[PDB]
Amino acid sequence: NVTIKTPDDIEKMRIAGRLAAEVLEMIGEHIKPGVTTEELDRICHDYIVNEQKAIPAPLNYKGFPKSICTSINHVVCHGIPNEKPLKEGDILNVDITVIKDGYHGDTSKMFLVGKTPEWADRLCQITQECMYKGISVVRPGAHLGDIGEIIQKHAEKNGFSVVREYCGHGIGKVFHEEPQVLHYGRAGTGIELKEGMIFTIEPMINQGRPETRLLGDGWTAITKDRKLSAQWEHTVLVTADGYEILTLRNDETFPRTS
Amino acid sequence: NVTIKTPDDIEKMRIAGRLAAEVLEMIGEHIKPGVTTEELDRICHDYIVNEQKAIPAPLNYKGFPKSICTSINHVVCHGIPNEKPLKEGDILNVDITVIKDGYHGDTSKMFLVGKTPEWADRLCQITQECMYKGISVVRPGAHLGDIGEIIQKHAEKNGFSVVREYCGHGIGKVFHEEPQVLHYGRAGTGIELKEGMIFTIEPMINQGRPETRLLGDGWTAITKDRKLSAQWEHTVLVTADGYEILTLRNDETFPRTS
Amino acid sequence: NVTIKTPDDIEKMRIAGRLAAEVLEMIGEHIKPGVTTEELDRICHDYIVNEQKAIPAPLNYKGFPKSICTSINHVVCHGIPNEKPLKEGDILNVDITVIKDGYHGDTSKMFLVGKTPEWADRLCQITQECMYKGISVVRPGAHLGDIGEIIQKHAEKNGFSVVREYCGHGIGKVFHEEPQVLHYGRAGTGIELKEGMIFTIEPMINQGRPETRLLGDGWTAITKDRKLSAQWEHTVLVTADGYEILTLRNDETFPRTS
Amino acid sequence: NVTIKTPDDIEKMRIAGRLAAEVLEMIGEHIKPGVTTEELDRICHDYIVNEQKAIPAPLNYKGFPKSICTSINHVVCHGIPNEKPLKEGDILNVDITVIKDGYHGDTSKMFLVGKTPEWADRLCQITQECMYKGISVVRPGAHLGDIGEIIQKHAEKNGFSVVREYCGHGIGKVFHEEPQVLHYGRAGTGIELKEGMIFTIEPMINQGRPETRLLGDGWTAITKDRKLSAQWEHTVLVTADGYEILTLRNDETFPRTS
Numbered sequence A, B, C, D: 001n002v003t004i005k006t007p008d009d010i011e012k013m014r015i016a017g018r019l020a021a022e023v024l025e026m027i028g029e030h031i032k033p034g035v036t037t038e039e040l041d042r043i044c045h046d047y048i049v050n051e052q053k054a055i056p057a058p059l060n061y062k063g064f065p066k067s068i069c070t071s072i073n074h075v076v077c078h079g080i081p082n083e084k085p086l087k088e089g090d091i092l093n094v095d096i097t098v099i100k101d102g103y104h105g106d107t108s109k110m111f112l113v114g115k116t117p118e119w120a121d122r123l124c125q126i127t128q129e130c131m132y133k134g135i136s137v138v139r140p141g142a143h144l145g146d147i148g149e150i151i152q153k154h155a156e157k158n159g160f161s162v163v164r165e166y167c168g169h170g171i172g173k174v175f176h177e178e179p180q181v182l183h184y185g186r187a188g189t190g191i192e193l194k195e196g197m198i199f200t201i202e203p204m205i206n207q208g209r210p211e212t213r214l215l216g217d218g219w220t221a222i223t224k225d226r227k228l229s230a231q232w233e234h235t236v237l238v239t240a241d242g243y244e245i246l247t248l249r250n251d252e253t254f255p256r257t258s
């Protein structure tokens, strides 16, 4: 079973989505060479807890030890904030999930630290475009495989591959619910969407091969071939006749709704 | 098979669309109780031929006897201008198509004649929204049934029904061409939209039931239940990033392109 | 693969279906206690061949020796018209298929012969209802298992069983093509329905248990428990919108389309 | 406008009328269950051509492919003789027109094939009575309407209906001339009868509703409700005193003249 949110649920999911988005709008100005990922963690934690009157969902979730994930360069996802400083040339994913009165909002973005290689800007830009294209096919009657196909085409046309062993997910009063949202596949397949469903689209897109590999800490996934990997995430509501992005930021120019 | 207009074709279509739009903006000022529909036909005729240096496409088209269509209240489409005066409380569709140097521009709008009942107003408002929604899903890679579903869902959800046996149409150097644009249907179905296609979105939406009957004159369609019917129409080009409304008027707030 | 009928095909399937419906409307007036099924076969054959200028598809089809099927009481399907007279109390299915210019129309109905017992009437009523419900979910993007599921649940919730080893079928210029249309199963399974597909929905529903067995003659299927079995069949087109019952009789009050 | 026949025309119309009568007197012997309408056709053709030295007027007349019309049961008129055997219980109309030296005689009667139901014998009788009453109001100064009214009043008192789409006709050296003789209407309407006019009275009376439909062959008209229809016809001269029935048979008791 996949849950269908009620209009009061939906109203609380917007509040949580907007706060998650705000963490990312806030954090931007602290992102520069020499800031450590655990300093970023601490800043986002304090903001969420003290200013938004909310809770960071990753903290202690299945043992995860921090409030945010910070994934740099060849790391695909789930990087643990630590004492390493950011370096000129790094690309950085900051993945935020906020819980507000029980409702979750989940989003992430890429940051380019200083002078980055040019393959890297474009990897980040195309990955963001993939997410947006997945979002744009969302409507009642669409199938989950439409999201995957349109993401996969756009990645592969640009010489990149789609990560297969991590995916998006339903979200609500629970952080991870059904369905699993694959970022590759075949249009018209998988389950059919319905108004009131909420789920994330969070493609991870690699510069080389798609395979990944888990590090010692059991969290941090990296690209097997050690090339770069980028991710962007939004929380998406299926509306009556399209989509609403619950986690849209004010820097973004993509439409909040269809 | 569906033509693909060239850059020069498109510019000529842009000119024809603007001209068709200007007929509607011009005629608005002559619409009031007491004026006859044949008088409005005359005024549109002379504006088209003598001022625009264009041709009224409907005139003698498969025997049609006038230069415009004028549909009042329960008449669904293709009403024939005549000696009957417009009455306080009527709703009037004026449907225009202009040929300029061989290129067609097709558009219609509703006019409220003097003081109108609120159920009439609501009909005209929902039909316009249906049309705008239909236009908003237009981009390369959309399908035709996306237009049909969004229109039908919006109408039916608000208590109205969609006319089934009349539809929009490809348009260019010919008045009526492939494809048929159904105002009902299921998204993802039908042909796939490509840049440079041009067709009309022209939903006819009824107050009660969808059924129509053709009167003796072989032209004038009415609602079978004799309840009200409204229509709005625009000529639409698929662009690289979405849509351009070639028949947009000055009095509209809905945007020209994506 | 499943054939998609062109619009011309469809117009010809509409003709064939009206003709098949008309046989059923005609033959109703000859059904009463005392008349043999042979005589009804003869009357149906004559009407089809001499008045409709059409052909009865069952005649000689895989050896079948008559023009219509006549299935009485515990007979589930494919009964052979014979010299036995109908008796008061009987329920009778007449299953017609007409070929008009190569195109097929397939439909059946239950007749109550004279005074029938109440449980026989209830069986016939629930079978018709099941057929209508099966038809009601037909539209583009539906799945074949949706038809099955809704028939099965209505039958079973009302105390009856669904016959499993006979099913509906694609039909057009051939009598029996893909897909197989099972009258039991699960929503969302099976092939997706598309505009232009045509197939029968013809559930056989039993008073008691679902199992059948085939008599010596190679054709006549009966209930294993010798209780009553009913069937109703229509030919159904998938339209842009939903469904169109090509075999609708003017005695029916269920809507021709959705 | 209508022609007046000369005394000499008249004497040649008597000859043709008598010969048409004699075809009907001859053919009764051969009417029994199992004989085909085409054999009756063939027998009539040969008698007319070889024994009467005349011509069967229906042959190749506007494409009609036989020498006589044979209408059975729910066939209203213009049945084409074919391979189908007459069946006991059938009512048959045999309609004859003989051309003798350029002059036409046109008449038909009902036959009962073997044992026949009571309702049917009665339709045939009442229809005969309607014709005779129709004949009985014929004199100079009578109006055509008189003929229609009195046939219609008798039909309707008996629960039967008059066919409106076919009618009697002037007849002479041409098969069909002015006027149209309607078998329904209001007394004192229509043109005024004058001595020397010759026309047919040929009422088709249906057991149920009046409406007809045409079978695919473009000739064979049946009752739309499929109920019985009967017809009888004579060719009638207007005289000094009243009427003369040119096609009276020797088995008939009604007076030849007024």
Ligand SMILES: [Mn+2]
Residues within 6 Å of the ligand: A095, A096, A097, A106, A107, A108, A202, A233
């Ligand atoms: Mn996340």
Ligand SMILES: [Mn+2]
Residues within 6 Å of the ligand: A106, A168, A169, A200, A202, A233
């Ligand atoms: Mn997530």
Ligand SMILES: [Mn+2]
Residues within 6 Å of the ligand: A071, A072, A073, A074, A075, A076, A077, A091, A093, A228, A229, A230, A231
């Ligand atoms: Mn990375």
Ligand SMILES: [Mn+2]
Residues within 6 Å of the ligand: B071, B072, B073, B074, B075, B076, B091, B093, B228, B229, B230
């Ligand atoms: Mn109207």
Ligand SMILES: [Mn+2]
Residues within 6 Å of the ligand: B095, B096, B097, B106, B107, B108, B233
């Ligand atoms: Mn128009």
Ligand SMILES: [Mn+2]
Residues within 6 Å of the ligand: B141, B143, B192
């Ligand atoms: Mn496509």
Ligand SMILES: [Mn+2]
Residues within 6 Å of the ligand: B106, B168, B169, B200, B202, B233
């Ligand atoms: Mn148009």
Ligand SMILES: [Mn+2]
Residues within 6 Å of the ligand: C095, C096, C097, C106, C107, C108, C202, C233
């Ligand atoms: Mn069948």
Ligand SMILES: [Mn+2]
Residues within 6 Å of the ligand: A143, A188, A192, C141, C143, C192
């Ligand atoms: Mn599906």
Ligand SMILES: [Mn+2]
Residues within 6 Å of the ligand: C106, C168, C169, C200, C202, C233
């Ligand atoms: Mn069948």
Ligand SMILES: [Mn+2]
Residues within 6 Å of the ligand: C071, C072, C073, C074, C075, C076, C077, C091, C093, C228, C229, C230, C231
């Ligand atoms: Mn049975």
Ligand SMILES: [Mn+2]
Residues within 6 Å of the ligand: D071, D072, D073, D074, D075, D076, D091, D093, D228, D229, D230, D231
């Ligand atoms: Mn008859």
Ligand SMILES: [Mn+2]
Residues within 6 Å of the ligand: D095, D096, D097, D106, D107, D108, D202, D233
């Ligand atoms: Mn005749």
Ligand SMILES: [Mn+2]
Residues within 6 Å of the ligand: D106, D168, D169, D200, D202, D233
């Ligand atoms: Mn005649």
